[PDB]
Amino acid sequence: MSDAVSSDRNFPNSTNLPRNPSMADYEARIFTFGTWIYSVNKEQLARAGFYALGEGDKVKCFHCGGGLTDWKPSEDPWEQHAKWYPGCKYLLEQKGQEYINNIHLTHSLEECLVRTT
Ligand SMILES: CN[C@@H](C)C(=O)N[C@H](C(=O)N1C[C@@H](Oc2ccccc2)C[C@H]1C(=O)N[C@@H]1CCCc2ccccc21)C(C)(C)C
Ligand SMILES: [Zn+2]
């Protein structure tokens, strides 16, 4: 008999809010990174599964672990994390193990651009 003390129905208790992206996700994550920037919006990076530890740039992955620093002028979080250590909960399940494996093998993204410049 599966008890299931989390995934079953809505309204867990009270404090546990649904999610609220533009309340404790977009502004919250970014607030941890700072006004500073480098490549993409830090929020986007956080959405994938990243969170700053107070200090600028020093950011680590959630659950899966693995710290990331000294980002590249043009790079995505999906490819970065998946390449160094593909073991995130939502990240893996998002595009299945197939996508994660494909990413960690050859170059990805950047397709359909007139004629490869
Ligand atoms: C252009 N891509 C950029 C984002 C990039 O890869 N940057 C690399 C990078 O940040 N790396 C390499 C990994 O080191 C390895 C991890 C796994 C396998 C092999 C090496 C580990 C990681 C790194 O330096 N992580 C540091 C180590 C000290 C503690 C700490 C705490 C919070 C955030 C980051 C870190 C370089 C610049 C340091 C090499
Ligand atoms: Zn991760």
Looking at residue 12, which CATH number applies to its domain?
1.10.1170.10
Q: Which atom of ligand 1 is the closest one to the Cα of 59? A: 33
Ligand 1 binding residues, C-beta < 6 A: 58, 60, 67-72, 80, 84
CB under 8 Å, gap of 24 or more: what pairs does 21-28 form? none
Q: How far is the CA of 99 from the centre of ligand 2 (A)?
A: 15
The amino acid that residue 21 corresponds to is P
Question: Residue 60: which H helix or E strand, with range?
Answer: strand 59-61
- C-alpha 44/C-alpha 77 separation (Å) is 8
DSSP, collapsed to helix, strand or coil, labels residue 50 as strand
- What experimental approach yielded this model? NMR
Joined tokens for residue 5? 């003390």
The amino acid that residue 18 corresponds to is P
DSSP, collapsed to helix, strand or coil, labels residue 31 as helix
DSSP, collapsed to helix, strand or coil, labels residue 82 as helix
Q: Which atom of ligand 1 is the closest one to the Cα of 58? A: 33
- Please state the separation of Cα 112 from the chain's center in Å: 25
Q: Which residue range(s) make up the domain with 97? A: 1-117
The amino acid that residue 8 corresponds to is D
Total domains, the chain? 1
List, as residue ranges, the binding site for Zn(2+). 61, 64, 81, 88
Output the CA torsion sign for 53, 68, 88, 21. Answer: positive
Strands (DSSP E) contained in 13-52 are 50-52
* 82 neighbors 95 (Cβ within 8 angstroms): no
Q: Give the strand order in the sheet containing 50-52.
A: 50-52, 59-61, 67-68
- C-alpha 37/C-alpha 43 separation (Å) is 10
* 85 neighbors 62 (Cβ within 8 angstroms): no
- C-alpha 89/C-alpha 8 separation (Å) is 19
